[PDB]
Design a protein around this ligand. Structure first.
Ligand SMILES: C[C@@H]1O[C@@H](O[C@H]2[C@H](O[C@H]3[C@H](O)[C@@H](O)[C@H](O)O[C@@H]3CO)O[C@H](CO)[C@H](O)[C@@H]2O[C@H]2O[C@H](CO)[C@H](O)[C@H](O)[C@H]2O)[C@@H](O)[C@H](O)[C@@H]1O
Ligand SMILES: C[C@@H]1O[C@@H](O[C@H]2[C@H](O[C@H]3[C@H](O)[C@@H](O)[C@H](O)O[C@@H]3CO)O[C@H](CO)[C@H](O)[C@@H]2O[C@H]2O[C@H](CO)[C@H](O)[C@H](O)[C@H]2O)[C@@H](O)[C@H](O)[C@@H]1O
Ligand SMILES: C[C@@H]1O[C@@H](O[C@@H]2[C@@H](O)[C@@H](O)[C@@H](CO)O[C@H]2O)[C@@H](O)[C@H](O)[C@@H]1O
Ligand code: FUC
Ligand code: FUC
Ligand code: FUC
Lengths: 87, 87, 87
């Protein structure tokens, strides 16, 4: 079991990603309760980074499964698969 | 032996958390010597994130101890337990 | 196989560090394609953080191998060992 954490704004919002048994899930905080995010993909290791473009949040999640890393992107309209490739 | 690293401010300040043999400890840099920080909690895995608000720094450290993630909060007066819960 | 991710600026730039087979390598995005960065150092675990001084990027990569963490710095003039020491 392995986690990644990011945050933004002043509230703040927090996202914590968890790799456990080859699935990555997301728990979210935006100032009230912790809830379950829409992020649900394969991998046994995860890292993440985020940035604001004005008020809009952008997140990149790096999900590693079987020796390969997939980038997942949030840009205000669901999780999309990104262009990242490895060595 | 696993690390998480965070930073803030113009200096910057840096914090590096290490999980080594089920304990998580902290080394700190504020613009001069590294020193050992107040953080000491149980875990084999650590992730962390931080933000500023009105010139004060807030840190959330996520400590995992087998099947369970525990949030630790720094808000300027000691490490307190946070509301984070997993899936 | 384990990763760390950082990002900066408006484009933004992203750097993803991957620890595998006791070597850490780096994949980079600056607004066009992904490329292989200059960073190449030993370690089985990796964490990273960064900040901008104006427009100038500073990166700190914490590479852990042999039960020991070495801080690697990017400050505009290649990758150098930093003053970080552990417990
Ligand atoms: C970043 C994103 O957050 C969640 O997505 C929901 C989104 O959260 C807002 C949040 O309310 C703000 O306070 C925060 O500053 O920004 C985030 C991102 O905009 O809020 C929108 C509504 O405005 C929507 O509820 C998003 O829901 C998504 O997840 C749902 C269930 O959790 C549904 O699956 C829906 O289809 C999704 O689009 C997280 O859910 C998400 O995974 C990201 O972490
Ligand atoms: C941070 C640094 O980035 C890469 O190094 C190159 C550096 O990248 C710029 C980038 O072009 C900008 O868009 C970005 O905003 O900032 C970074 C850092 O200034 O740019 C310089 C030229 O200004 C140079 O090309 C750096 O290349 C170095 O790595 C190369 C391999 O990809 C070659 O080895 C070259 O000889 C090196 O100077 C990363 O490669 C690097 O590891 C750092 O991550
Ligand atoms: C944010 C915290 O940093 C360190 O605490 C510092 C204290 O040790 C002391 O030096 C005061 C006085 O300026 O600064 C504090 O920031 C850590 O010890 C602590 O765990 C937090 O990381
Ligand atoms: C910032 C960029 O966003 C999307 O375009 C991804 O396809 C890229 O890999 C990068 O993450
Ligand atoms: C930003 C919030 O700070 C405290 O209230 C914690 O208990 C929450 O879980 C969250 O970390
Ligand atoms: C910001 C600082 O940069 C250099 O002076 C390093 O040697 C320190 O360890 C620290 O990372």
């Amino acid at each position: 079991m392995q986690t990644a954490a990011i945050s933004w704004g002043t509230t703040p919002s927090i996202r914590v990603y968890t790799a456990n048994g080859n699935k990555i899930t997301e728990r979210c905080y935006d100032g009230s309760n912790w809830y379950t995010g829409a992020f649900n993909q394969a991998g046994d290791n995860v890292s993440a980074t985020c940035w604001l473009s004005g008020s809009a949040v952008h997140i990149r999640v790096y999900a590693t499964s079987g020796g390969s890393t997939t980038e997942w992107c949030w840009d205000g309209d669901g999780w999309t698969r990104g262009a990242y490739t490895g060595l």
